[PDB]
């Protein structure tokens, strides 16, 4: 007969549905594709496509809602067909605007806005953007909005994807990248002190650096303080021009271009 046959949706999107039907043998002038929400009194929308084309994309919809789509075949110059109709639900919406709230050498913390759809939970994946590493997966409850992914590697750009979970399908991921910082220098050991000098050695972190920054400040007394920039191939420092009988805090920051380590700190007093 003249009714279209085997109407189905072939691709579902939070905002769009792609439908297709069987092209009839004798040519049709044009089709009438009405669509509206299943059980909603808001006005139905409708558009036409030429008889040559056997597919249609319905755009500008809402996510996670059931739609009824109806197709008519027009032949006159008019004369309409019997309606063929299907119902389908759009894909649930994704969370939005993710924030990175904390970045360390082995973890990244993120916060996101909840999806608008009803959600049963979240699935969060973390994988390196370029280096072919493993994909870590963590699950969050429906009312959760923040997560910390531990077990990461230093100065690695990670891709963090958040998926909203729902029985009627899972959302598309909310995606954000972040770079972990560098480990701190280990075992800041003070080796020697003189009236005006200070000598400190440390263990370097386990990633290649661009240099070090050392700063020494008196804790309770006041006077000039010192900052020193070191080469990456440094395991010790000697800071001169200090004051006698002074409590000096010493901190060493590892540097990798824009990446700054958390300090290895200690305090020591100069000789009498």
From Swiss-Prot:
Post-translational modification: Sulfated.
Protein name: Fibronectin
Tissues expressing this chain: Expressed in the inner limiting membrane and around blood vessels in the retina (at protein level). Plasma FN (soluble dimeric form) is secreted by hepatocytes. Cellular FN (dimeric or cross-linked multimeric forms), made by fibroblasts, epithelial and other cell types, is deposited as fibrils in the extracellular matrix. Ugl-Y1, Ugl-Y2 and Ugl-Y3 are found in urine.
Lineage of the organism: Eukaryota, Metazoa, Chordata, Craniata, Vertebrata
The Fibronectin type-III domain, residue ranges: 3-93, 94-179, 184-272
Subcellular location(s) per record: Secreted, Extracellular space, Extracellular matrix; Secreted
Gene expressing this chain: FN1
The protein's role, per its UniProt record: Fibronectins bind cell surfaces and various compounds including collagen, fibrin, heparin, DNA, and actin. Fibronectins are involved in cell adhesion, cell motility, opsonization, wound healing, and maintenance of cell shape. Involved in osteoblast compaction through the fibronectin fibrillogenesis cell-mediated matrix assembly process, essential for osteoblast mineralization. Participates in the regulation of type I collagen deposition by osteoblasts. Acts as a ligand for the LILRB4 receptor, inhibiting FCGR1A/CD64-mediated monocyte activation. Secreted by contracting muscle, induces liver autophagy, a degradative pathway for nutrient mobilization and damage removal, and systemic insulin sensitization via hepatic ITGA5:ITGB1 integrin receptor signaling.
Clinical disorder: Glomerulopathy with fibronectin deposits 2: Genetically heterogeneous autosomal dominant disorder characterized clinically by proteinuria, microscopic hematuria, and hypertension that leads to end-stage renal failure in the second to fifth decade of life. Spondylometaphyseal dysplasia, corner fracture type: An autosomal dominant form of spondylometaphyseal dysplasia, a group of short stature disorders distinguished by abnormalities in the vertebrae and the metaphyses of the tubular bones. SMDCF is characterized by flake-like, triangular, or curvilinear ossification centers at the edges of irregular metaphyses that simulate fractures. These corner fractures involve the distal tibia, the ulnar aspect of the distal radius, the proximal humerus, and the proximal femur.
Region of interest called Disordered, as start-end residue ranges on this chain: 119-143
Assembly behavior: Mostly heterodimers or multimers of alternatively spliced variants, connected by 2 disulfide bonds near the carboxyl ends; to a lesser extent homodimers. Interacts with FBLN1, AMBP, TNR, LGALS3BP and COL13A1. Interacts with FBLN7. Interacts with COMP. Interacts (via type III repeats 9-14) with TNFAIP6 (via CUB domain); this interaction enhances fibronectin fibril assembly. TNFAIP6 may act as a bridging molecule between FN1 and THBS1. Interacts with TNR; the interaction inhibits cell adhesion and neurite outgrowth. Interacts with FST3 and MYOC. Interacts with SVEP1. (Microbial infection) Interacts with S.aureus FnbA.
Domain of life: Eukaryota
Residue spans of biased composition, Low complexity class: 125-142
């Amino acid at each position: 007969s003249d009714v279209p046959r085997d109407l189905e949706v072939v691709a579902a999107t939070p905002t769009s549905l792609l439908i297709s039907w069987d092209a009839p043998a004798v040519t049709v002038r044009y089709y009438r594709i009405t669509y509206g929400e299943t059980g909603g009194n808001s006005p139905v929308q409708e558009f036409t496509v030429p008889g040559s084309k056997s597919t249609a994309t319905i755009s500008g919809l809402k996510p996670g809602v059931d739609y009824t789509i109806t197709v008519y075949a027009v032949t006159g110059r008019p004369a309409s067909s019997k309606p063929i109709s299907i119902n389908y639900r759009t894909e649930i919406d994704k969370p939005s605007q993710m924030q990175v709230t904390d970045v360390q050498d082995n973890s990244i913390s993120v916060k996101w806005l909840p999806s608008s759809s009803p959600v049963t939970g979240y699935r969060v994946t973390t994988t390196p953007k370029n280096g072919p590493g493993p994909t870590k997966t963590k699950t969050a409850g429906p009312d959760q909005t923040e997560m910390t992914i531990e077990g990461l590697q230093p100065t690695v750009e990670y891709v963090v994807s958040v998926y909203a979970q729902n029985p009627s399908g899972e959302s598309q991921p909310l995606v954000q990248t972040a770079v972990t910082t560098i480990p701190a220098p280990t075992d800041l050991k003070f080796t020697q002190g003189t009236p005006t000098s200070l000598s400190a050695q440390w263990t370097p972190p386990n990633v290649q650096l661009t240099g070090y920054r050392v700063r020494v400040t008196p804790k309770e007394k006041t006077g000039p303080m010192k900052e020193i920039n070191l080469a990456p191939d440094s395991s010790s420092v000697v800071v001169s021009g200090l004051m006698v009988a002074t409590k000096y805090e010493v901190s060493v920051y590892a540097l990798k271009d824009t990446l700054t380590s958390r300090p290895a700190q200690g305090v020591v007093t100069t000789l009498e």
